[PDB]
């Protein structure tokens, strides 16, 4: 019973925007609050600005100490690639690279992994080194985490302080903080709970047909659904007229809302009490069962 | 500007009577325009009532007495208007 189907595929290049949902690898769930220009965030003595600012106060409450260790490794990891970046930028000879990389992969305790770059190649070694520029990738088995002393030893291969915290300068201030702060390289994910498609609002549109209330859902211009708990919450205040207004004009009274819509554009803000026809509808349904129900007077 | 209503509450010893009299007063300003009784700072009539009530020169009965004297004045004015209309033919 159908002639044709037309399928259209459309694409959106959607970027980050404040209010989005952001997370890492250790349940440190969060939300981007504000985007600020580059100079505002603190920067090291070497001029490099930090990218992500996180609240330390989530650590002791949630006992997520492991992300601190991962941060120390990330600072340690990126330190290796930078010097390699320094070495290759000044076009040094490959054997100088080799032993240095040979220093990296033989470091630590008696790990089962053994490699020898002298048996690989020359040009493939150079290609690996070029691919190695963005930090030397490291891994750890799940229940075989490298000890803290090993982390410090790998830091000694780099040229960073042993304790793993740096003095920072704030662009607004331009002075050292009283306590040094730990920085590093975190791995961050991204979540499909985008803020933009969560955002929705509805001034006035279509209504239901069986009854006369607005619909729900971001599609087809749905409205917010007012539940009972907050009805009693208003009832806890003296919010009489607010509750009556919101439960009659902007929900059910078809003639009432039209009059107010005329009133609003005319500068009047006087509510017109009416008759909730949803109650009338229910009334008729009660009348449907052959039991007489009626309103006594005016 | 205006931030709280505590002064008006301590003036009129009922939060519920406060909102009622303020709503009435703001009704006479916004619809059927009269003047405010206090200099404004580019704000709508709702805030203006709070200024007026907190200055201790509007309460429920002040509105009541003003409205009844205004209505008897306009009733009298209607009386002279009707008599003048009748005397127009005379």
């Amino acid at each position: 019973g159908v002639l044709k189907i037309v399928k259209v595929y459309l694409a959106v290049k959607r970027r980050i925007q404040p209010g989005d949902k952001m997370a890492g690898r250790h349940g440190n769930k969060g939300v981007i609050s504000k985007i600020n220009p580059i100079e505002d965030m603190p920067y090291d003595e070497n001029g490099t600005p930090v990218d992500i600012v996180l609240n330390p106060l989530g650590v002791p409450s949630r006992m997520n100490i492991g992300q601190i260790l991962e941060t120390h490794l990330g600072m340690a990891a990126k330190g290796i690639g930078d010097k390699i970046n320094a070495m290759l930028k000044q076009q040094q000879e490959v054997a100088k690279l080799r032993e240095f990389i040979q220093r990296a992969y033989d470091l630590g305790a008696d790990v089962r992994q053994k490699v020898d770059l002298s048996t690989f190649s020359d040009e493939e070694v150079m290609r690996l080194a070029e691919n190695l520029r963005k930090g030397m990738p490291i891994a750890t088995p799940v229940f075989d985490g490298a000890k803290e002393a090993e982390i410090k030893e790998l830091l000694k291969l780099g040229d960073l302080p042993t304790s793993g915290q740096i003095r920072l300068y704030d662009g607004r201030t331009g002075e050292q903080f009283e306590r040094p702060v730990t920085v590093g390289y975190m791995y961050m994910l991204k979540l499909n709970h985008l803020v933009d498609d969560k955002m929705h609002a509805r001034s006035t549109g279509s209504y239901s047909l069986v009854t006369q209330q607005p619909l729900g859902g971001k599609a087809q211009f749905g409205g917010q659904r007012f539940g009972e708990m907050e009805v009693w919450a208003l009832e806890a205040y003296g919010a009489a007229y607010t509750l009556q207004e919101m439960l009659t004009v902007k929900s059910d009274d078809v003639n009432g809302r039209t009059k107010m819509y005329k009133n609003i554009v005319d500068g009047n803000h006087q509510m017109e009490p009416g008759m909730p026809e949803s109650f009338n509808v229910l009334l008729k349904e009660i009348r449907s069962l052959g039991i007489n129900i009626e309103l006594e007077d005016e | 500007a205006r931030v709280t209503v505590q002064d008006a509450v301590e003036k009129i010893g009922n939060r519920f009577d406060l909102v009622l009299v303020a709503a009435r007063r703001a009704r006479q300003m916004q619809v059927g325009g009269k003047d405010p009784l206090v200099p404004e700072e580019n704000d709508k009539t709702t805030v203006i009532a709070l200024r007026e009530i907190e200055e201790g020169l509007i309460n429920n009965q002040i509105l009541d007495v003003r409205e009844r004297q205004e209505q008897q004045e306009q009733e009298a004015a209607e009386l002279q208007a009707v008599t003048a209309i009748a005397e127009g033919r005379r």
């Binding site: 009832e235 205040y237 003296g238 919010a239 009489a240 007229y241 | 519920f16 009577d17 909102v19 009622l20």
Partner: peptide, 18 residues
Amino acid sequence: PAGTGYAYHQDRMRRRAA
């Protein structure tokens, strides 16, 4: 007949329905 509407209803049952 709980919050501000009590003042109205206080008039409501007093004037009429009494």
